[PDB]
Symmetry: C3
Subunit: 427 residues, 3 copies
């Protein structure tokens, strides 16, 4: 281990809370499911930050409660059982909970038990918008009064912040919160800790991983070998009370110099199609790639912690489409261009890159022995701000799926060919 | 956690040994194999309470020894090697053991070694009766003269105890010990701890899990949403020296009131076919369901600990059949009725219910955080008596399969598609 | 546990370092790949003694470096990326290393970083000969000038040592080092610790495992039930500075008496075709079977530790073939005789025998509780000499594949049907 590495002792001491957040940052908004994954009267179980959650849509509205019956701890989502529009029951011994408050309102065949009304399961705020269902995953005692607006946990918005983050080379990127904003994308389970997956996206030295991607050569893009920071303010850290907590990288300004060649190794980025974009990341770990893959379109990614060694990777493209005609155009371009060449192809390379790095960090070795360099100003800056502004460090799961990694149940599922997942299998 | 739960500190302190028996209660009788699973000269390896056991039938008689060669620990049952009617040898280096005493009588190519005769492997008492092979799984130092009769670890017998446990609504249930008693059923590995699986069977609130079983609607049975205890003596605890240690639930008396409806949730048990039955459980955890699924027929279930997170679930129906004609009638009704609709269909629901609860308890969380209620007087009573009368608590396996859950051998088998099991695979 | 066992307290205290070497003996030569597994410009990743290693052949020469980018710990071998004949780069962020020295010579898109030239990855000496690529697996601080010749970690050579180890009953066995020596064989991943796999080969009581092998009856050989030591010097321990450290068993002399029958168990070796051979073993655990399976042919086996519970089992036959005609004859006899009946068939029995013994030892039980006898003078003598002469005890892997056994990546691969392995899968 060399003394020339950027992550010296002083630096590492500045992001200890981050090193301690293997299970994720709790008391934050996270995408749970796409709207199309939860239809009227549909019940679905998931897990975020080690917390089991069950969702149900009733009369168009989505509710989220802890997917754990307080009687004997079974998941309520395994065999959806709802007798009324305002409740959800446990299919085992009948404990029934209020969808709105989570209170134990009754027990199917024991309506007079003294336990009734004296407790309940945790509820989770829901915010559904433009095809996406967001859930505020919180600790059992986090007060309702303290739940912040979804926007505080989403990337910086434009044109609102165009003055703060000038972007003369491209039109303003839309937000999932914008009217008529349309979302196209997917989410799949990633194998490995969320942090390692998250740091990949806004790292300007990692773009080497895409040197051979088909889209790069089909579009004849000008994708440099990497970018280099030229000043100490190459990244702007934002931490104002009202608004997202994160950072903006001044890409395509002199603060980040592109490297298009290395004669010594025989490398040279040949391409004439200019490709302008800009990355930023905000808690709980949301990436925004402005002007990607084309003008008026933006890419957002999430790395939702499921357990301490699995995460749900979200990848979406957003574009404001005011007319039916605009939507069809976007849908078409997504189907025959973006999805196959970008979300798949371009980003698939990131999938394996993130995985390949997991073994170094899981047992703690990497958090101490990694030897960072100049370009690592990005992940380091993120780790420090995340350590400073997270709303809580999730505790390890106890008495829930994932609390123990080598159960006979997990070996049974694995034997059957089922990989670690996210959405609870029913029946 | 509410203070209104039935399992308060005082109550929990009364079943600590039960909480400590994840690997099972040792020094007890357990069903090992059905007679048809061990033919003349056949050798089979199994595991109970973490103890590897090998069985061989010679001249019609079944013998059981520890399935662990004392030389270098291989399982004798993996490659059956018996050179004489009175012994069993290890296929690796030839250590040979007397079937009757387990003593090391010789070594194939080293007959004069000083180790010979100075030690041996543990032997286990066997009691085969009416199609079932029972084995007394005991500690290495449990004395032969202390081995109790099989009947002490089997459900209460009728008509013998008809006066003690009056049953005016149905004829006496036969015992596996009765003359001409015929057994039909099966056993299969269950994924999860034996205790959690065992408590499901005699829980009168869990019957909600069967509300949709085909047999219930085909027979138009009257299966209530659940039963409620009406008095403190709704369960009779029996603990007399000579006889089984367990409890009898006074089902179909005032002590247990049926709940056939819940207007508030829109539920109502419609059915005119009366279905009378009664459950009881005795150590080491044997369920008896009198008058099920029909008069003169009784169901017995075992949840045999294999390791601390797997068990062998036994499900059988018994009926005394004095004539060849009687046997054919029973075999036919089993084949085209009981098996498809009862053992499967009805009880398959229990399979998944038991599994769904395991995650809450494995790491210990559930044993402390569960919030039991009135109907839980059943499991609680069982836990207490089990704690007071068990003949020993099995120690974790050491140097045997299952001692370590994440070995490369297990990952190899899992990769090959093999689930955790019970019967040792040979060759 | 009997007091008549050969492994008494005093004896066990003499091989404690061996009990401590679950991850293998480091600073030793091990076979890595066959020459045919690494062609010109080919890159391959493996793991030995818990150390990740990547090899590349350039201009006919093979180089070996630690398969771990010092930047953020990914394996360099997962996506081979070499820009010049003298280097290998990390496909993720461009760190580039010198094949010869392992020094960090540059970073693709950050050629001026101060970290460059101040560190590098470990290099491993390579010795390719007659179709086999040997690698000297060493600790990061083991001096180049201290690397010993390959011959020191290979079995004793003949005729060089024919006087020291007289063999009147068969011609001298060739070495892999001999000119015109031809190698035919294979290596496959073994499931279980390397030590337990290794001790099987030179155990003269284990041959009982082959009593039913097809080759034995087709050749009508004379394979005794086992051999017995008759004197204290039945094994010669060699530990001279210049040369291999190991032991030679005086098979086919009066020091080892064959046992061809056991009337008491009805066993009798009925064979008239004499089969003369001799076994020896040297650090790091290399077996030599002289005159096997025929004259002028010798069998060598390795049990290379990968992790502490997996090893790469090597099985090869060597014969000196001076002419093209000789090579074809050897190839033909290997293809239609040795491979199907010897490497497979005869030795496949050992595969499962070794596996069946692993559970007893992994958690440490077997190393203390095994009850060894007279014939175990072989494994005991080996354990003592290994404890005394090993060049180092490998430390458990940290931050590398195998450091943690139950990662989600491992369950993902297992679910996909992939068994624990050795060669790193690419792309
Ligand atoms: O640095 C970068 C460059 C391109 C890119 C594209 C999609 C997602 C994240 C990305 N990050
Ligand atoms: O409470 C019950 C009710 C029915 C039943 C049927 C088979 C086995 C166990 C059973 N337990
Ligand atoms: O003791 C023995 C006897 C035969 C043999 C054959 C191949 C490999 C190892 C062997 N060891
Ligand atoms: S576990 Fe849910 S009602 Fe019993
Ligand atoms: S392990 Fe059974 S004789 Fe050696
Ligand atoms: S992990 Fe290899 S250059 Fe970054
Ligand atoms: Fe990328
Ligand atoms: Fe049931
Ligand atoms: Fe062998």
């Amino acid at each position: 281990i060399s003394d020339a590495r950027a992550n010296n002792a002083k630096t590492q001491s500045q992001y200890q809370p981050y090193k301690d957040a293997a299970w994720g940052f709790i008391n934050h908004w996270y995408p749970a499911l796409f709207t199309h994954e939860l239809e009227e009267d549909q019940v679905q179980g998931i897990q975020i930050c080690g917390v089991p959650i069950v969702l149900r849509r009733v009369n168009g509205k989505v509710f989220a409660l802890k997917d754990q019956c307080l009687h004997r701890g079974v998941r309520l989502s395994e065999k959806p059982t709802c007798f009324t529009k305002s409740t959800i029951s446990c299919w085992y011994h009948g404990f029934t909970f209020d969808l709105e408050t989570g209170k134990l309102v009754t027990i199917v065949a024991n309506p007079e038990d003294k336990l009734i009304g004296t407790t309940g399961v945790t509820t989770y705020p829901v915010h559904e918008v433009n095809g996406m269902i967001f859930v505020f995953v919180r600790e059992d005692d986090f007060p309702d009064e303290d739940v912040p607006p979804l926007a505080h946990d989403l990337p910086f918005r434009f044109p609102e912040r165009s003055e703060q983050f000038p972007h003369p080379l491209w039109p303003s990127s839309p937000s999932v919160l914008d009217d008529n904003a349309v979302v196209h994308g997917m989410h799949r389970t990633g194998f490995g800790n969320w942090r390692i997956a998250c740091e990949n996206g806004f790292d300007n030295a990692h773009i080497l991983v895409h040197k051979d991607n088909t889209i790069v050569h089909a579009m004849d893009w000008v994708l440099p070998l990497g970018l280099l920071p030229t000043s100490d303010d190459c990244i702007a850290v934002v931490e104002d009370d009202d608004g997202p907590k994160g950072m903006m990288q001044w890409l395509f300004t002199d603060k980040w110099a592109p490297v298009l060649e290395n004669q010594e190794l025989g490398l040279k980025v040949e391409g004439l199609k200019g490709r302008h974009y800009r990355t930023s990341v905000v808690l709980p770990g949301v990436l925004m790639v402005e002007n990607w893959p084309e003008e008026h379109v933006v890419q957002y990614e999430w790395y939702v912690p499921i357990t301490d060694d699995t995460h749900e990777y979200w990848e979406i493209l957003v574009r404001v489409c005011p007319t039916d005609e605009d939507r069809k155009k976007f849908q078409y371009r997504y189907d025959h261009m973006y999805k196959p060449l970008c979300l798949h192809g371009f980003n698939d390379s990131d999938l394996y890159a993130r995985e390949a790095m997991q073994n170094f960090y899981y047992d703690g070795t990497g958090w101490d022995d990694e030897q960072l360099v100049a370009t690592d100003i990005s992940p380091i800056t993120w780790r420090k701000l995340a350590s400073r502004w997270n709303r809580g460090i999730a505790k390890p799961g106890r008495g829930v799926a994932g609390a123990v990694k080598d159960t006979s149940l997990i070996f049974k599922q694995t034997a059957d060919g089922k990989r670690p997942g996210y959405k609870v299998e029913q029946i």
